[PDB]
Amino acid sequence: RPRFSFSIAAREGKARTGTIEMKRGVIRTPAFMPVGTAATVKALKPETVRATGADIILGNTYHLMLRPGAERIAKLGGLHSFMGWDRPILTDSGGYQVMSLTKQSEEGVTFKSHLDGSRHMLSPERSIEIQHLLGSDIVMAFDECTPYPATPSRAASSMERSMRWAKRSRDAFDSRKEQAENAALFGIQQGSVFENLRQQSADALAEIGFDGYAVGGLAVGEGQDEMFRVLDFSVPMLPDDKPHYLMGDGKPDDIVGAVERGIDMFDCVLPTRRNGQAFTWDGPINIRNARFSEDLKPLDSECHCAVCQKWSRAYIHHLIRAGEILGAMLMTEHNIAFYQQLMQKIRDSISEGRFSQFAQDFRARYFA
Amino acid sequence: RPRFSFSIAAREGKARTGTIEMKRGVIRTPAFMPVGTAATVKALKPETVRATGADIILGNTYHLMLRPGAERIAKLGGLHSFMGWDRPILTDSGGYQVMSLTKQSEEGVTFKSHLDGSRHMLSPERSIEIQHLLGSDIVMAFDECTPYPATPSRAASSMERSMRWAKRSRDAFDSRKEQAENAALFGIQQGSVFENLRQQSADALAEIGFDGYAVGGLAVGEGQDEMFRVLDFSVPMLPDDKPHYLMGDGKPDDIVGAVERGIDMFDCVLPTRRNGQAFTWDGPINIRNARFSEDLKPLDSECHCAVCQKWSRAYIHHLIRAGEILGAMLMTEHNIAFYQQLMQKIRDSISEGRFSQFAQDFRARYFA
Ligand SMILES: Nc1nc2cc3[nH]c(NCCN4CCOCC4)nc3cc2c(=O)[nH]1
Ligand SMILES: Nc1nc2cc3[nH]c(NCCN4CCOCC4)nc3cc2c(=O)[nH]1
Ligand SMILES: [Zn+2]
Ligand SMILES: [Zn+2]
DSSP, rough: OOOOOEEEEETTTEEEEEEETTOOOOOOOOSEEEETTTOOOOTTTTHHHHHHOOOOEEHHHHHHHHTTTTTHHHHTTTTHHHOOOOOOEEOOOOOHHHHHHHHOOSSEEEEEEETTEEEEEEEEEHHHHHHHHHHHHHOOOOOOOOOOOHHEEEHHHHHHHHHHHHHHHHHHHHSSHHHHHOEEEEEEEEOOOOOOHHHHHHHHHHOOOSOOOOOOOSSSSSSSSHHHHHHHHHHHSTTTTTOEEEEEEOHHHHHHHHHHOOOOOOESEEEEEEEEOOOTTTTTEEETGGGGOOSSSSSSSSSSHHHHHHOOHHHHHHHTTTTTHHHHHHHHHHHHHHHHHHHHHHHHHHTTTTTHHHHHHHHHHHOO | OOOOEEEEEEETTEEEEEEETTTTTTEESSSSEEEEETSOOTTTHHHHHHTTTOEEEEEEHHHHTTOOOHHHHTTOOOOOHHHHHOEEEEEESSSHHHHOOOESSSSSSEEEEETTTTTTEHHHHHHHHHHHHHTTTTOOOOOOOOSSSHHHHHHHHHHHHHHHHHHHHHOOOOOHHHHHHOOOOEEEOOOOTOOOHHHHHHHHHHHOOEEHHHHHHHSSSOHHHHHHHHHHHHGGGOOOTTEEEEEOOOOOOHHHHHHHOOOEEEESSSTOOOOOOOOOTOOOOETTTTTTTTSSSOSSSOOOSSSHHOOOHHHHHHHHHHHHHHHHHHHHHHHHHHHHHHHHHHHHHHTTTHHHHHHHHHHHHHHH
């Protein structure tokens, strides 16, 4: 396989389906990428993550640099070896998490760890270096995420800094031959909810040139209507022939609408982030609800996951109420498997030119 | 398979190896039974428990009657169906846990739940009924566990009550035809550390007649030397042709010494009860220790478990330090697998008439 090759096999409106080929594997798109915060997808062995249908998982520069440490992971052979996942890994650049979980400048950001108050630094150069030490396959440019709401002036300043940092990210990545030859680099579009700023950002990123393009700065409190409105004009600004990655915690309905608007890749803590919510084709349920205490049906009536083949709502209800680890294991496996089945139905429907109908049928039932 | 058949295939001194055949499966002895408190062996799917080599698991009348409820489990099809373990299950009678986690009389005990302060009752009859509702394969007689230390008078009174309750347990079990025909009933020897009381207890239990005999009232603070001393005289008092079950939280060394003294069955929360302790042939280690932070070796150098085939000490160290659920999953699987490999080595060595040598070699290395 090549370092990076994105091929579009079929289209319907703005929606696309295809594949990203990389050295460690093929990624089917549109793709859902389970999140593996501290070098683990919570409550799942990598083999289980793979069995649900995942082609790629996400790690994070911020969390891993704090614990167990980027240099330590490199000494131990890299993230893939460390956690036992041998397929592609995308790593976020740490920008969002630093400002979510501090001294900022044009050079980068210095901050105190939320774990032990130790002092750390991140810059475009250090972020790219950390992602190298982890051995990431898809490296994200280091950006400044703009808070919502943002004034046009502040959104502009932040976007402009992010574009300067995008060029610095590009150059740092390219100067490291092992990384440049084996990994891919994605740029991140900023500009808040403003069409002109989004256009300037897209133009800057395309001029620099990246392997893929993320839409950043959304899923930060603006709500679905606004997010979809911004996607309507923002995604077409990005190079058509490269993958488009929406950063943020998308519900099933977010994913369907985003695919309708040209997004190819998604992450989400939501299905992982044990709190009792299980996804079904008839909408989410909270398994803690007393109504499930004697319900012998599986979490979802159609789901082909191992959890729905073997255990009842009643059992999972009991486990979650009792705070048992197996409850988190079963809920997480089902939810990630559900998301993957959603992606498969999306891919198949686009391939067959019936995605618009699928989206309508999905929404009618999910929100009935 | 029959309701119950214990066959001894080989012997060495007081040690025995053989099989218990029951309707739901064969149990190889000496046996280690993983503990499944709230209808789950903590952090493991039943398939994983089976893969480690377990033939039977333990449940508890006390915990299950409180949550999710015995009648509820029966309505849902029984414990096996509920949790997805189709092999034999032994259930403790609830006696110990009530007094560990209250109004006592000759009729039984009434108590408040430690979960919600709701009031409950246990008696020989109710305990046997609950074990029936769960669908237990090996049912334990309801007893009164004697605190350590105990005066000879108090040990005698408690032992005598336990023997009266043993007869009541026997009669309750026999009067329920479905239970009598499909399950087995074990009696529990009491008498604290006193040889005469242990003899009286053994005689009473043998006169009533049971499918197996537990040595109760040990592992309650007396220490290994004293426990072994009491086992020295107590086990030979029990019928030779039935299984002998030591109740309590045995370390690997406890198990080896107890087998040397004629015990056939063991339970233990120890390998399950995530706190960082991993068993190895060179003794236990605590994976949280900083010395393991960059150790690429598996938990144990010889262990054939899936954890030791795939992940390093360094990774498991990180997971446990970070409080990640996968850490508990991996530690638990390894520890239960280690215990099963210990049991296999014990069974093989007795079969080959070299158990005494195995015990010596094991101790020399484990305590080096
Ligand atoms: N580098 C970078 N990373 C991003 C990550 C984002 N995540 C979100 N929204 C989801 C936030 N989740 C909610 C659930 O808890 C974890 C955080 N929105 C995000 C936006 C960005 C971004 O603009 N840049
Ligand atoms: N019915 C019955 N059950 C028993 C269970 C026993 N368990 C122990 N010792 C181990 C105690 N563990 C220590 C770890 O935490 C859980 C309790 N000692 C035990 C003794 C008995 C007993 O005499 N009767
Ligand atoms: Zn499912
Ligand atoms: Zn192991």
